[PDB]
Amino acid sequence: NETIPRPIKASFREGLSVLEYFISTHGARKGLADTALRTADSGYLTRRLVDVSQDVIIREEDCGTERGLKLPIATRDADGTLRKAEDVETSVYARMLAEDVVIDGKVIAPANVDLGDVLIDALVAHGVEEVKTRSILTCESQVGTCAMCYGRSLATGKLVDIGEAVGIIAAQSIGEPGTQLTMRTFHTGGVAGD
Amino acid sequence: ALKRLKVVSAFLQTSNSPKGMVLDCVPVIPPDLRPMVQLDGGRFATSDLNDLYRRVINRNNRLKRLLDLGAPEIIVNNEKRMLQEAVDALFDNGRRGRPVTGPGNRPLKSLSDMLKGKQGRFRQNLLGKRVDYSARSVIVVGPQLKLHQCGLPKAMALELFKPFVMKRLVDLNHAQNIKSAKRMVERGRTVVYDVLEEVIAEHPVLLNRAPTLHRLGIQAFEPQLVEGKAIQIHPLVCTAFNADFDGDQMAVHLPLSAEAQAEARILMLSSNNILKPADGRPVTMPTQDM
Amino acid sequence: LHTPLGEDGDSEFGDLIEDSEAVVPADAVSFTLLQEQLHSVLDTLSEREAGVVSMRFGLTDGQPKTLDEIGKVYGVTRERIRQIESKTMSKLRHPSRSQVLRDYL
Amino acid sequence: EGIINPPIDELLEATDSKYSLVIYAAKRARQINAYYSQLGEGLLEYVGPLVDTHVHEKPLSIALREINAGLLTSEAI
Amino acid sequence: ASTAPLRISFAKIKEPLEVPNLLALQTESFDWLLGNDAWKARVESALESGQDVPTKSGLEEIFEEISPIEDFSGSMSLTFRDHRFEPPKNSIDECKDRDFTYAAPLFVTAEFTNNETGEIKSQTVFMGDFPLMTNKGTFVINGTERVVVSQLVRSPGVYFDSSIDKTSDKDIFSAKIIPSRGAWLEMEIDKRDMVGVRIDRKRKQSVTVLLKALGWTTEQILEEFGEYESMRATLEKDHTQGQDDALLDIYRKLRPGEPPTREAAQTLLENLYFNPKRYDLAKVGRYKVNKKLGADEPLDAGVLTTDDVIATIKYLVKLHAGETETVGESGREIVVETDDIDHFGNRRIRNVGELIQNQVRTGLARMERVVRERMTTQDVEAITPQTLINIRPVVASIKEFFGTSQLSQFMDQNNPLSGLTHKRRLNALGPGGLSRERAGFEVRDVHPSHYGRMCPIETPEGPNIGLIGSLASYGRINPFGFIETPYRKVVEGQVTDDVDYLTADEEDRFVIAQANAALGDDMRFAEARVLVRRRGGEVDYVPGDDVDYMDVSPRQMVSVATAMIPFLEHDDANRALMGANMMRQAVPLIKSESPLVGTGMEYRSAADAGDVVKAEKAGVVQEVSADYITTTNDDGTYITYRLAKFSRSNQGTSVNQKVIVAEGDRIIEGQVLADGPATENGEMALGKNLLVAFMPWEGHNYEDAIILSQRLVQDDVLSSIHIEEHEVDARDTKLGPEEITRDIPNVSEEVLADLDERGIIRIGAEVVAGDILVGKVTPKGETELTPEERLLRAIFGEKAREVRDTSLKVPHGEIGKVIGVRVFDREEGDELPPGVNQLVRVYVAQKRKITDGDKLAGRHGNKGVISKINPIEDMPFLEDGTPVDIILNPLAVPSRMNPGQVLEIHLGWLASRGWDVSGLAEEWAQRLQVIGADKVEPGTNVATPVFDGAREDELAGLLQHTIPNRDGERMVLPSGKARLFDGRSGEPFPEPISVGYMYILKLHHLVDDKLHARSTGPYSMITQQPLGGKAQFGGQRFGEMEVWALEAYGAAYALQELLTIKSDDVTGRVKVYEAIVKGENIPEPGIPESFKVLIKEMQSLCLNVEVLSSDGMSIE
Amino acid sequence: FDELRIGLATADDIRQWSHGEVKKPETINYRTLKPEKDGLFCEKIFGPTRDWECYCGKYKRVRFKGIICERCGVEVTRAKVRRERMGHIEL
Amino acid sequence: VHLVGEVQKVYNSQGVSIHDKHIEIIIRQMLRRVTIIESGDAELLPGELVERTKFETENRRVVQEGGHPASGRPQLMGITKASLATESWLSAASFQETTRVLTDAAINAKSDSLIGLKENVIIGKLIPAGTGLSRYRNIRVEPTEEAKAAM
RNA sequence: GUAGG
Ligand SMILES: [Mg+2]
Ligand SMILES: [Zn+2]
Ligand SMILES: [Zn+2]
């Protein structure tokens, strides 16, 4: 992790210089070594997740309670306007509303209905700042967890059938991009632990 | 004290007595599981457990010999120490100091050593097993195929479908009897290939790549004969496997039972997995050229 | 056996060599079809003829019976049973009940 | 003339699930395959194909054909 | 003059120094080891030239260091004065054919001398056949060609390290002395503000006890060390005093459990460190330590001295004190600093000679202990040098090194280049060195000392990234074991025609300039500003006359393989690595052609490799035939070179050899007479050159798949021979002998149709899967004929005979014509191993044509699997009707950042169609005219040195001035793109397309090898689960991740069958097979066996693993 | 299959599992290549190497399976029983 | 919230996006146990991991018995530790550790209930996930009477 | 060991 005072001054069209080429291989070999290690570590991590994530299978049609989770439906609302959350998709889409929402004295989104583009856009237009979505964390199921709390499956785009193994799909999704991450601090900066 | 309470209560609630700490009669592995299988060339193949058992029984014999006659305390005590060393090496070789290196090039295997780790029993021969009715080959790109079609080479197909092609050949009277059918398929006549072309359709095959990061590794497809010696594959699904075409061998399996092929047609079919399970977006629409 | 052969993944040399005690399903099912066809072909013959040949070759029980040994339960004399065994040899050796069994060897 | 020829959505709405559809179609496929493999006993419990069939056919395809027709019915014990 | 065929050169700078012999590394090292006439001749040549060189041969040295053995009485001695060799008994061809280790006799004159007898008895004795290495460089053992690869290991020396401990919040300094052979010792200063010793890291202790145990007194100790407070604190806190007290205390600590003994402890210390035999410091180690510690001429060979220990202590304390320059103990002033292990001033290479010498040394150590034991148990006057020595350890050790040793590797023979490369590798993996699990980030990465000592570009891509690397182009080996690099001398700003060889530490002091830097017409620099490199890998420039050394050739950092790739400068290193790794796998073809565009060094790479056959004399050829070529020098010596023809290589490719020279043509020494595989006119040719165009095409080149015309299938342009050889053995078993015969039992007639009289396949008879090659029958076996089979025999009247068929058959999925058959027999004069009575080898050969599935790749790393071969018409053909022979997906070349190939393709089109440049007055035209590459006829090859290649301006000008191929029109546009007419539709393509000629290589990852299938096959004995591998019909393993995916799908039943029915359940396999053949439905699965085996294993360990049901016991 | 109870195996349990015991380090004869007596690979405790074939030549047939011949005491059965049967060593 | 935010921002650093339910399942898993404190009335040890369900059952039992409950504090441990301390010995053995888990199971004399997946892939029975569930598999199949009326 | 993934 040491930057050079004299950077490369030529394009691969123009053709590097011999010294420049030597300096380039420095980083490239290091990157290759890092990838070989990152793949190994990612495989290990995936095994740990999938083993710890087992035994979580959907074994009930509908939850027993009503307690939900508070999520920010819209954020960074500039002055005189309402702006939806930047990364709303990963968070609140495909989630089950624990209870109905009334903003003008009329129900807008009915309960136990998944949320897509149209419904979220409507709620944002109405101007509600937050939302209460059902989720596994507050789920109260005598056996495992219920289908409603986990909400619709992303892959099938439909409500999760009973008996689906959610743990293994969770582990696989978490583990797959580990090889793709390949992120590291560019330079220690000459300081350790900062 | 808290740690001790745990163990004593565990002993007390269990009906078994603690005296099992001191085993007296050492079991022995059944002979087959530790085979002294004959090897061509006058040589022999032996599992190290045979050597460990030889060591322990030999030392027990010598201790019996000493105890029979009047012997000093030093020698009998050393002998009992030796017996304890042999037994411990049998259960665990290398749990204390240098292991019993046996031939000297490497340590000797032990029972516990067999049940542990990457090469152990559990993680290599109970959660992953080799399987009959499978194959492997390089995979090449064939555009004209449909989303449900993959091109199996001829030889791989015929080897894969030997019971079925044989059954149809005898049923169609192309072969006289079963032995004649086997000889016929081994010979490889055009009639065999035609029967095969008849039997493969409407029978799923699971294509599958090696890393299998996420559930889009295993994908069912309809078979379809094609010349050459390489699997063909539908270019849209390639990015689900993360499979490039520099060169990449992809395994093929068969759902043998009726229930298995029902699962292949309904669940693992290649036309019902457009969306990557991670975040709910299209994944089966690659982008390199089209 | 527990020696490294080639790479660590290849591991023990034990894996490389096949066994012999394994029942090859191909040969076993070949034998089963041979058994079924042979029993059917015997049933093609007369009841007594098939029975005497089966006892002469132990098709019901692992030990074949000698000619005189067949002439106790059936009540036939050793030469009578010898004669009809020869006639069964004649009856089976026709081209009729031979095409199916030729391919089984 | 292919796996996808019976579309899945009708079967799904018929059986109200994905896995129940699999086990149910597989049970029907097993039943019909047992029927064709009778070779002479003629057991009354066994039932022939309700839909027309080809000279050579995979049983589970006929099972799925029956389900898509919707004529065959299921009921849990 | 006529060394190589003419090839146009685009080089811009002249190269004074010629590349050395590419294979010097192995041949010269083994030459030193043997100490034959060649080594001594080279030694005297160096001496008269003034060059330093070890004057003592290896073998005689290892004999000499073994002192004559002395008993407890010291009465007797054995002197091993002179060693010698004899010519090998077996010819190299004979050794290869008959499976004999190519060795020679090695004798030595042992002289017995006993003072009690007062007599000297000389006798010559023979230690054993010594594995020799042939001139081509490979150890022939057991008929196979193996090679020992050089090993990178840290040199013996004193190594200093600095680090930071977060808990301490302060710097920590340590030192370690790495001996060549002895036990290791370390010296850590201020771990907790105090200094301490690590005598093999046995127990905690101080330094004061050590010094006190030595003869050095506290008074002189503090006098020398009164200037640094840390040592004073250590001394004062040390309560113990006196040499005896410290000595007994350290002895107790090292070996507790017994009362201390003064003399025993003293002898222990002498043995550990002062004993010459026990502590061994190589000459290199001694050489290194003195420079590091600055001691002026210590003992040239000898163990460490207390002087050395105190000097290291002084260096360590000076370093921790913050002082950076200090007087060396009994030496000149020196910088005191920490040193990085990565720098090759500390790294060293163990060439083949030193490795073999080390194993011979171990063997002679075994011999010494054995003979000492014998003398301790032998009577006087009955002792002879012939009788007392046992030669078993030496022969066994050298044998144990060439078989079953990582550094002794199978010689790849895919092509000459893979040859040379596997010769020159520096395998850091190995015994007494860095291991795979031991690897870290630091060792793998490149270091600024790599220039000239290792090609940083190329290495295996697998987990052993960078650990293995090829030698640099000009690298030569320091006699100690470092790698030197040649540098041109620079004085007062003029480059001089003198070369000096500099090592990994000498190079640091000076400043090294750049080769590509321009020079004036005179020897002075054209520009005051010149880029230079300096200590620590710094790249700062220094204008004006300041440098003293500069690189001789631009390609100093690139090994041979990486030096092949033209236009490397324009390539990302990642893809250059891919290409270099993929340049060692090209298979030769029927007809080889040198590349049209490529580096000008390929000729040397082909020449030095032994595949080519060159003449040793300068005469007139007398007879030219395929089998043999006869030459006659003017002196009168006649020599007939026998050309190997269609003999299997290591990887199974033909080693066919052509002939080039005519009948009466004059020859010169070293001139090439016959090309080897993948060779043409003495030049490397690893593939062919195809006309090629960049454009997508109906997805048949999607994701970098390739499309190639059927014309390559038509003209055998890409066709490779493949020779497979496998054998069978007749062995006398317990029951009886096995027989080879045409009378195979229980078979048809036509199967044994083409066989020989004795039951062997004739020559020329094509074979298929199931064909009988050699008929073999078991002697007998106990046959209890079954009731059903009994009846069947009775009906058909056939006799089942105890002899059983065990004949050889073609393994499944094969094809070929038999080309040769060899038989060895016991009773005949030929020797065989025990038991085996006759051995038969059969050669089956085919001509694999380029087909779908064959891998294929360009030099720059564009590799793909052929996905379709259209007829010659569907090719998008060009204006004059020339079809394109291969299509490529352009989407690669931006993302892969490897635009070298576009330069290559344009230059290839340029090379195919000659150019004329005369009187153009253009800068590029002037550059070609001065270079001389102005007038070029079509098809004549060209050279683009790796870093002095063609500039884009030159390409543009030449393209604008290409000779008209036809109709007086230039067919490619100045842009480098031409008009393509679609073959299928016929409409001209909307815009022009790029087209040219690029070299392409047929790799050895062929489909035919990889293809595999299994209905049902053999099974493993310990656990019934099917075995693996292709040679034994193994089914593909179902991995744990695989079952996780299946669990995710929820498809339980498919998992259940894939786990139980299709393997791991003996009772279910036969049942399912009968069910499928009978058409009956599949039965319910049974319990797997492996759980049963596991249960027995847990039960064997006193764990009562009991399967129990909810209602009492369970049923299984 | 309902539960895999595991726990301490007492000496009585090991004796109960054992169908006999082992007394020698003998494995096979160098010449007959056959199992020795009362040692490792001892057919008298584990089982016949060949299917329904005893050691002493007395019985080699499948018909009269399920019996012990007093000559070598081998219980004629399928060879697979060797994969299951186990003995013990007394210290 | 902190865990989901941290992991999500790390992933979004590259750009890959993962739905938050997947994380929520794992974070639920890591939080499952509770460290018991003041285990006077409950009669088991103080200061050890206990399953949340087990803790609730014990507290309900003791309060029903009239004695005051023993206290508990939610405690977080890495996935490895929670995985090892699982009621299923077979699954834990199938994990990285064998000798210790085999030993402590043996001394404990704990019978493995086969509820779960990995242990049921060991025995080779049908996994209770997807097609293998009891409700799905117990169905019986027969056509309608009008079917036989037609043919 | 060494190549490909
Ligand atoms: Mg790949
Ligand atoms: Zn819920
Ligand atoms: Zn017997």
Short mmCIF file of C-alpha atoms and ligand atoms in Angstrom, two decimals, chain F residues 54-59 69-74, ligand 3:
data_model
loop_
_atom_site.label_atom_id
_atom_site.label_comp_id
_atom_site.label_asym_id
_atom_site.label_seq_id
_atom_site.Cartn_x
_atom_site.Cartn_y
_atom_site.Cartn_z
CA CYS F 54 -16.39 -72.00 5.84
CA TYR F 55 -12.65 -72.11 6.52
CA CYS F 56 -11.95 -75.82 6.90
CA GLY F 57 -13.24 -77.27 3.63
CA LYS F 58 -16.17 -78.99 5.37
CA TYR F 59 -19.01 -76.80 4.05
CA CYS F 69 -19.61 -76.38 11.61
CA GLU F 70 -17.78 -77.71 14.66
CA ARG F 71 -14.51 -77.97 12.72
CA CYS F 72 -13.76 -74.24 12.38
CA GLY F 73 -16.91 -72.90 14.06
CA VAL F 74 -17.65 -70.60 11.12
ZN ZN I 3 -15.70 -75.22 8.50
#
